[PDB]
Design a protein around this ligand. Structure first.
Ligand SMILES: *[C@@H]1O[C@H](CO)[C@@H](O[C@@H]2O[C@H](CO)[C@@H](O[C@H]3O[C@H](CO[C@H]4O[C@H](CO[C@H]5O[C@H](CO)[C@@H](O)[C@H](O)[C@@H]5O)[C@@H](O)[C@H](O)[C@@H]4O)[C@@H](O)[C@H](O[C@H]4O[C@H](CO)[C@@H](O)[C@H](O)[C@@H]4O)[C@@H]3O)[C@H](O)[C@H]2NC(C)=O)[C@H](O)[C@H]1NC(C)=O
Ligand SMILES: *[C@@H]1O[C@H](CO)[C@@H](O[C@@H]2O[C@H](CO)[C@@H](O[C@H]3O[C@H](CO)[C@@H](O)[C@H](O[C@]4(O)O[C@H](CO)[C@@H](O)[C@H](O)[C@@H]4O)[C@@H]3O)[C@H](O)[C@H]2NC(C)=O)[C@H](O)[C@H]1NC(C)=O
Ligand SMILES: *[C@@H]1O[C@H](CO)[C@@H](O[C@@H]2O[C@H](CO)[C@@H](O)[C@H](O)[C@H]2NC(C)=O)[C@H](O)[C@H]1NC(C)=O
Ligand SMILES: *[C@@H]1O[C@H](CO)[C@@H](O)[C@H](O)[C@H]1NC(C)=O
Ligand SMILES: [Mg+2]
Lengths: 338, 1183
């Protein structure tokens, strides 16, 4: 009926069924009380779990007057080529470290999240495409070619500036007995996807990694070709554990990176009480811009590290929540048909 | 001392024999080169315009320039264009090839398509008026032709009830002496018929087709002038050319009536007609929210510039303190630190530019298009009888509907439906026809009594007094058989019986009703030849003879006749206004107080009354006055005044008969609509071109002005305004030394003071009259005006004398309950609208039909046209067009306020989702050396405001509603919160921005605190950029979508589906980009590989997102709850108490049977008729 009457459906007349929520007072109060209680409990759990973790640091930088490694504080010429001034430092443990132990190194004032620095890498070549190896991208601009004009194998400033220190740990069994070295499981120290999907060294021509890197000069600051980073075929090249760990950039200018973990056969527990020594190999220069270098022994829990921030934040939020709950209850009660 | 006439409609004093030369035949004569003008190129058109009509704006090939010029009136487009130019400079590009141009083109083309669809719609609406098939003389006979091909100089022929296509000169018709009857209800709002007399010479010559196919006459009329009533000119037909005047002219919007056909010469056409000169200056309309968005964009631009400058300074300082000392941030460049800061300035501009993103005018357009299409799908705005669906025509002025301050409305055709319908009468004391008013059938039903005893009843009147007809049948009283006979003798109606059944050709609406009532109460009216009129009194025919017809006049206000019966006896019958009769009645009438006290009841109802009397002239005294006005009839310069003197000589001893009543028929729903709109704090002014008396019964009928309301005509207003202005400035007799104009001492605070103003007094008050030529000296030159800085003619300063009367009058009309302007030129209506919108800055709506409201409809903020009738001149220039006045209830109290609310919600949420997103890089800048590093993934910044958060806001801006419309018309007061800009003004925008900055702060600084130290579980990738970016991004797409759930108050299914679809889309596309699947065959495109499925697998990261969400979302709930039980808003109160409330059904009449302070003494007299219909006394224009 009618040549121009509209269709009269539900949508076209603004009549779609719809639930209309009014913010009542029987929903606000239970929310601000239950949520507050849950936040209090959860934050208390986090706070106590973040405090049962023991850490130990040294700051083996040689900058000040005091310190074993300060004897080999360098100057502005470049003295890595002479002896690496291998220093050492001693400590004692009166108790155990029940649980597997992790060893990190920490740098400060190191801006690994600078925009120009962070994008100076060639992800395509680093993936392992057999064609992209010879031609890097223009982004690794001051680390793209060489003095002889040859292409570089990594093509980046992140790969050029790689941490080149080393550490070893020794323990004494009997009083006066000589120190002995304990193992460091230096394997599986990265994400499983990083050294199985991200990074793959190119296929073997004539069956050798070395024979597939011709022309590719090493980065200017290194001292070894990329295919020589370790005498182990399963850990060499773009999938070297140290190299892949270093390339996962950090978020803040004070970061740490995983170096090793102590869980091997001789004692699959914490470090027994006694006397320990660590040999270092001072090779990375950081004093030029005012950096720092630290070693860190630690353990873990379900949450992770030893940050007390988030638990305290939860406690504060829960306290504020319950206080606002009482304030709202009082305001509601005093106001009824007024 | 010529005072205002208040009867004239001063078409003069509005502007700012001269060779027009039509010579109507041989078209090629007007194609001569000298007549037609010249333009820059070969494109020179003519002087005589074509008869086509154009309303559309975009022609074939100016749609590109003209649309893009109005497109950049928005500041955001200049913003985007500046960014486009910036991002193309090679020294700072930070991007790939030009993929930042295409989105701008898509955004800029969507609006072009949307603004082209409307143009197409009106371009096809414009087609109807151009295909109406008049008849023209092509070479031989008459042939059917379109309107658009009528050119100036064409002989045309028109039939009855057909519109007049162009300004024509009438030259012949099919009536005696070749005259025509026209009506002009679309030109000046009148409702009675006018008569145009053709020239005498052409009457006796053409008369026929073959002679009409021969013509040589010239016309020397003036140029198009917009006067509508003068038309000087001559006609060189042949052999001593004949002059012309306005009595021989038909205009465009007029329609022929009661003449079979007529012929004419076309004189004007198209945009040269006298009705196309009154509609002028169509403009580009922008709503009130656009002027707010422009300021938003400017302040955001300033903020962006300042922030980028600050960060650039910070980077410059950082670079040569720690940057140029690090061997790992080495570059082959040698840029000095200042140049580094200068380059980081542009990098931060580009990074932080995503405030005001490109999807701002793509969502506004969608929202407004959706609401516009909601308007014309409304089944409750559809008129069943005339079948019109109430469409919307602009789709861009849509949130303006909820901010209206004033309404201006025409009277004829907008508030009334042009029906007269005689209601009741008062014969000798008691009134007749309440509903039963009898003893027989007084306790029966209230059905209509039949008239099945005449051959003339024809069933067209509804009467209910069984007593009146019962007595009439009984013949028990001869005091009524005389009264109802007067109605059938005192008029100028002409009868043209087609075939047996007789129909009445009445020139005035107010006379047809009386003759119809007389005919269907018996007492029919048969032939009226020239001197004798025949009356069928109760089936018995009689023939009297008319001696004189003392005609109607405007300042006389009465009409009478003198007849003689076959029984040799003369009588005089008169009818007219009470206030002029009561100085004429014989001083013996017993029933004067009875009828007078019954004349109030009628006037207490909203209806118009007349008074009737007769006089016994005997058969002797007559002769003296008969030859007296024989001597005074045929004269030279006193036919209209000496005859008036001899008229006022037998208006003594005029014993009464009783009074009548007639009732206008406004429409179904006007007074309820007016009451509803008055509750919502809107003011209604009625601007009409109709008579002053007629626009008072409408004022009382629609209850704009009622009892206990002073009227205060303009006579009083001029005196009051003069007294307040001339005195008490620094003068007024005794000086005051203060003379404070601050107190509104115009009227004491008593309210209910109406204001009825005529056009002439409107001119007088506003200090605007034309000056005659004998008042100024000469032109501008150093002879009349000397060297002393042009002291006389260049020193006008009439704006000092003006600009005070205007402001004073506008402030006077601010405190009146209702203002009615009558007899106004089409230009003066727009003048009043512009005055009200210049001072006391307000949003105005103008509604009305017909061609005399086009100017006012164009000039107001919103123009609504009434459609469904035949003439559609006010519908093609409007913005919205329904078919009844009452639908104004839903266009404002339902659609308008919902649209305003939804747009304000959208604008409040949009500028919150955008700072929470962009303002994180700013806080991050303090921790990475001010290096313009971003805190999100690369693929998240180009998909955030496209996929993740774009649909929920559209669904909320379309489907949301505060309260249902079933009770949004019950509470019109809810309109007020939109009328005063209380939902989104400038002060609220800076609160939405504060919410945004706090959200960004709490979204960045919690994850940073959690990420300060290690976060690894068993793979131990300690705090790293990838996981940090994923954590920050995934905790924003949740809070920004839970917030939109705290805004929607109408949760349809699609709303919840949209919200959770947004969240799930983000998560499920992130787990696809960060995957081993597409790392192959796309190596260097997706930076974050394998991090999503490796960071989101540990509890510590999830305990960080939950806390951020709970902190940046929970105090909002607290604030809402704490601001709702202390200051519950009006809609909150309505929604809270909706469970139990009573129904409502009201508006009976506001009955006021009598007052204890009787003071009115104001008569409801009104008669719509003209002067000069005494042609019968000259000759019988019957057959
Ligand atoms: C652990 O990692 C650290 C990384 O910090 C390593 O230390 C770095 O080892 C680099 C060697 O691989 C060494 O790089 C060069 O050092 C010397 C360069 O200094 C020369 O130039 C200085 C001026 O600097 C400007 O010179 C160039 C050219 O003139 C300009 O274009 C440019 O703007 C430079 O700013 C002078 O002031 C110096 O006196 C000196 O003249 C050199 O020994 C080497 O330069 C090479 O030169 C030619 C070029 O073709 C080669 O053919 C030649 O064989 C030389 O190798 C050298 O490349 C870094 O200085 C050094 N310290 C840093 C980066 O702080 C450790 O070695 C590493 N230890 C390990 C692996 O055990
Ligand atoms: C810290 O700040 C200092 C000074 O502000 C920076 O030292 C500057 O390094 C620039 C990088 O090369 C130097 O620019 C010029 O270096 C040599 C000088 O002769 C010049 O040949 C360069 O031209 C080329 O870039 O040279 C190569 C060489 O093959 C060409 O291939 C190439 O086409 C250009 O022709 C370049 O013009 C600049 O001279 C130097 N400052 C001074 C005072 O010498 C450090 O780099 C900054 N950063 C640190 C120390 O880490
Ligand atoms: C490094 O520091 C350790 C202790 O922090 C030094 O160890 C002591 O060395 C002296 C002589 O070198 C011995 O007599 C002590 O018995 C050592 N302490 C022990 C075994 O607990 C060590 O000498 C430092 N290395 C230097 C200075 O090169
Ligand atoms: C370890 O340190 C001790 C202390 O001198 C000594 O055996 C030697 O310097 C280091 N040995 C190795 C293998 O580095
Ligand atoms: Mg009208």
């Amino acid at each position: 009926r009618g040549a121009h009457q509209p269709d009269n459906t539900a949508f076209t007349q603004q009549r779609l069924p719809a639930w209309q929520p009014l913010l009542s007072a029987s929903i606000a109060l239970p929310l601000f009380f239950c949520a507050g209680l849950a936040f209090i409990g959860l934050g208390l759990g986090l706070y106590y779990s973040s405090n049962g973790i023991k850490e130990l640091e040294y700051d083996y930088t040689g900058d000040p007057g005091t310190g074993n490694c300060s004897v080999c504080a360098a100057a502005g010429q470049g003295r890595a080529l002479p002896p690496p001034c291998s220093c050492a430092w001693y400590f004692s443990l009166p108790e155990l470290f029940q649980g597997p132990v992790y060893l990190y190194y920490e740098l400060t004032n190191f801006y690994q999240n600078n925009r120009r620095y962070g994008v100076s890498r060639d992800d395509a070549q680093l993936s392992g495409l057999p064609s992209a190896l010879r031609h890097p991208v223009n982004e690794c601009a001051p680390y793209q070619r060489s003095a002889a004009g040859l292409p570089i194998a990594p093509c980046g400033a992140i790969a050029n500036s790689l941490f080149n220190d080393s550490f070893s740990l020794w323990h004494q069994r009997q009083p006066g007995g000589p120190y002995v070295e304990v193992p460091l499981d230096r394997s599986g120290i990265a994400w499983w996807t990083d050294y199985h999907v991200k990074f793959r060294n190119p296929p073997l021509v004539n069956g050798s990694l070395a024979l597939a890197f011709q022309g590719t000069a090493p980065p200017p600051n290194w001292r070894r070709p990329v295919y020589e980073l370790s005498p182990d075929p399963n850990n060499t090249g773009f999938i070297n554990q140290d190299f892949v760990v270093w390339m996962r950039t950090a978020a803040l200018p004070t970061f740490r990176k995983l170096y090793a973990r102590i869980r091997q056969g001789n004692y699959s527990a914490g470090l027994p009480r006694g006397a320990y020594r660590v040999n270092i190999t001072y090779n990375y220069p950081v004093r030029a811009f005012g950096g720092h270098k630290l070693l860190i022994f630690s353990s873990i829990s379900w949450m992770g590290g030893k940050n007390p921030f988030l638990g305290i934040a939860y406690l504060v939020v829960g306290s504020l929540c319950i206080l606002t709950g009482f304030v709202m209850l009082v305001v509601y009660i005093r106001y009824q048909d007024q | 001392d010529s005072q205002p006439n208040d009867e004239v409609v001063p078409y003069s004093d509005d502007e700012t024999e001269c060779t027009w030369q039509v010579k109507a035949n041989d078209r090629k004569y007007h194609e001569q080169p000298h007549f037609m003008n010249t333009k820059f190129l070969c494109i020179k058109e003519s002087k005589y315009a074509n008869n086509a009509i154009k309303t559309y704006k975009y022609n074939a090939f100016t749609f590109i320039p003209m649309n893009l010029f109005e497109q950049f009136k928005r500041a955001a487009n200049l913003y985007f264009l500046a960014l486009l130019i910036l991002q193309a400079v090679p020294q700072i590009s930070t991007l790939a090839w030009y993929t930042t141009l295409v989105p701008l083109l898509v955004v800029l083309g969507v609006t072009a398509i949307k603004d082209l669809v409307d143009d197409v719609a009106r371009h096809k609406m414009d087609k109807e008026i151009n295909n109406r098939t008049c008849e023209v003389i092509k070479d031989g006979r008459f042939k059917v032709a379109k309107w658009k091909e009528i050119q100036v100089g064409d002989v045309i022929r028109l039939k009855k009830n057909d519109f007049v296509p162009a300004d024509i000169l009438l030259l012949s018709s099919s009536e005696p002496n070749s005259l025509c009857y026209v009506e002009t209800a679309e030109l000046d709002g009148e409702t009675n018929l006018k008569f145009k007399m053709s020239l005498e010479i052409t009457d006796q010559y053409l008369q026929r087709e073959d002679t009409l196919a021969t013509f040589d006459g010239f016309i020397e009329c003036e140029e198009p002038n917009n006067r509508l009533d003068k038309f000087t000119g001559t006609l060189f037909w042949r052999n001593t050319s004949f002059p012309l005047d306005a009595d021989k002219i038909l205009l465009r919007g007029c329609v022929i009536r009661n003449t079979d056909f007529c012929h004419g010469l076309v004189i004007f056409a198209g945009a040269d007609t006298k009705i196309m000169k009154n509609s002028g200056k169509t403009r580009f309309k922008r709503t009130k929210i656009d002027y707010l968005m422009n300021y938003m964009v400017y302040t955001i631009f300033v903020v962006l510039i300042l922030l980028s400058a600050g960060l650039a300074i910070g980077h410059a300082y950082w670079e040569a303190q720690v940057g140029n000392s690090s061997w790992y941030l080495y570059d082959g460049e040698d840029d000095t630190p200042s140049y580094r800061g200068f380059l980081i300035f542009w990098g931060y501009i580009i990074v932080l530019n995503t405030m005001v993103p490109i999807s701002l005018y793509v969502s506004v357009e969608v929202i407004r298009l959706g609401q516009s299409h909601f308007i014309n799908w409304d089944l409750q705005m559809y008129y069943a009888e005339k079948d019109t669906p109430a469409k919307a025509r602009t789709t861009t002025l849509n949130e303006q509907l909820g901010q209206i301050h004033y309404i201006f409305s025409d009277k004829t055709g907008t508030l009334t439906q042009n029906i007269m319908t005689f209601k009741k009468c008062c014969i000798n004391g008691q009134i007749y026809g309440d509903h039963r008013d009898a003893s027989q059938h007084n306790h029966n039903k209230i059905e209509q009594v039949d008239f099945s005893w005449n051959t003339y009843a024809d069933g067209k009147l509804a009467f209910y007094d069984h007593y009146l007809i019962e007595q009439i049948q009984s013949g028990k009283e001869p005091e009524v058989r005389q009264f109802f006979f007067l109605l059938a003798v005192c008029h100028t109606v002409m009868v043209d019986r087609t075939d047996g059944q007789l129909n009445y050709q009445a020139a005035s609406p107010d006379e047809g009703a009386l003759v119809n009532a007389a005919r269907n109460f018996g007492f029919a009216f048969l032939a009226r030849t020239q001197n004798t009129i025949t009356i069928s009194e109760l089936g018995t025919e009689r023939t009297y003879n008319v001696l004189a017809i003392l005609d109607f006049n405007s300042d006389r206000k009465r009409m009478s006749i003198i007849v003689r019966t076959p029984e040799g006896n003369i009588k005089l019958y008169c009818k007219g206004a009470d206030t002029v009769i009561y100085e004429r009645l014989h001083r013996m009438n017993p029933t004067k107080q009875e009828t007078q006290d019954a004349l109030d009841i009628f006037a207490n109802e909203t209806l118009r009354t007349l008074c009737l009397c007769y006089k016994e002239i005997e058969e002797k005294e007559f002769t003296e006055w008969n030859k007296k006005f024989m001597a005074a009839s045929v004269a030279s310069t006193n036919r209209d005044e000496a005859l008036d003197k001899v008229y006022e000589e037998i208006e003594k001893d005029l014993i009464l008969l009783g009074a009548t009543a007639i009732e206008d028929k406004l429409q179904d729903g006007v007074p309820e609509t007016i009451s509803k709109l008055a509750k919502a704090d809107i003011k209604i002014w009625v601007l009409t071109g109709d008579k002053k008396e007629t626009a008072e019964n409408i004022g009382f009928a629609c209850e704009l002005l009622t009892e206990d309301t002073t009227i205060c005509y303009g006579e009083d207003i001029n005196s009051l305004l003069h007294a307040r202005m001339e005195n008490q400035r620094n003068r007024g007799g005794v000086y005051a030394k203060f003379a404070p104009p601050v107190q509104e001492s115009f009227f004491p605070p008593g309210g209910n003071r109406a204001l009825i103003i005529t056009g002439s007094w409107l001119n007088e008050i506003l200090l605007e009259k034309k000056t005659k030529r004998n008042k100024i000296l000469k032109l501008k030159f150093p002879r009349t005006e000397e060297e002393r800085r042009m002291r006389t003619q260049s020193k006008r300063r009439l704006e000092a004398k003006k600009e005070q009367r205007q402001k004073n009058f506008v402030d006077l009309a601010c405190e009146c309950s209702a203002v009615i302007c009558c007899r106004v030129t089409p230009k003066q209506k727009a003048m009043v609208v512009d005055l009200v919108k210049r001072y006391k800055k307000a949003i105005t709506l103008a509604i009305g039909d017909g061609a005399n409201d086009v100017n006012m409809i164009k000039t107001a903020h919103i123009g609504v046209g009434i459609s469904g009738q035949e003439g559609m001149q006010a519908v093609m220039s409007s913005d919205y067009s329904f078919a009844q006045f009452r639908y104004l209830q839903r266009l404002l109290l339902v659609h308008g306020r919902w649209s305003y609310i939804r747009m304000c919600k959208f604008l409040r949420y949009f500028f919150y989702k955008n700072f929470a997103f962009t303002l994180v890089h700013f806080w991050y800048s303090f921790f990475n050396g001010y290096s313009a590093q971003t805190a999100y993934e690369d693929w998240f910044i180009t998909l955030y405001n496209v996929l993740y958060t774009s649909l929920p806001v559209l669904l909320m801006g379309l489907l949301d509603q505060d309260v249902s419309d079933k009770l949004s018309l019950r509470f019109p007061g809810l309109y007020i919160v939109g009328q005063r800009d209380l939902l989104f003004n400038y002060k609220r925008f800076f609160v939405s921005l504060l919410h945004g900055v706090l959200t960004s702060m709490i979204l960045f600084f919690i994850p940073l605190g959690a990420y300060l130290q290690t976060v690894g579980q068993d793979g131990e990738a300690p705090s790293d950029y990838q996981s940090f970016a994923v954590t920050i991004a995934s905790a924003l797409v949740i809070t920004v979508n839970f917030q939109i759930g705290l805004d929607t108050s109408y949760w349809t299914f699609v709303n919840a589906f949209s919200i959770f679809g947004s969240i799930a889309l983000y998560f499920g596309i992130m787990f696809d980009f960060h995957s081993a699947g597409i790392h192959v065959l796309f190596p260097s495109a997706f930076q974050f590989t394998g991090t999503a499925s490796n960071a989101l697998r540990q509890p510590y990261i999830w305990l960080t997102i939950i806390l951020a969400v709970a902190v940046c979302l929970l105090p909002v709930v607290a604030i809402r709850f704490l601001s709702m039980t202390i200051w519950p808003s009006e809609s909150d109160k309505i929604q809270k108490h909706r469970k139990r409330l009573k129904a409502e059904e009201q508006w009976q009449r506001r009955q006021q049977v009598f007052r204890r302070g009787v003071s009115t003494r104001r008569s409801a007299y009104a008669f719509s008729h003209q002067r000069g219909y005494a042609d019968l006394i000259s000759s019988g224009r019957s057959i």
